Design a protein around this ligand. Sequence first.
Ligand SMILES: [Zn+2]
Length: 83
Amino acid sequence: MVSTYDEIEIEDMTFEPENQMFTYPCPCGDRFQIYLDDMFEGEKVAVCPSCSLMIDVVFDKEDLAEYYEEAGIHPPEPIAAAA
Ligand SMILES: [Zn+2]
């Protein structure tokens, strides 16, 4: 929270149904990518891999868990089914 230009929202971001990640065409002219696993560890201040602009994207932490069921990706650790 030292250097920031703008703030983006998860709701106003695209979804990448391939490896559980989000995308957002950075104003610089590139595509700002962000993985759900990375952001899970408190990652809001991401650095663009083109212009290196500091942005603070906010997340609700809702779709982060729901998307896991929507996407057909193979997450780490075994899955035990018990009820
Ligand atoms: Zn950029």
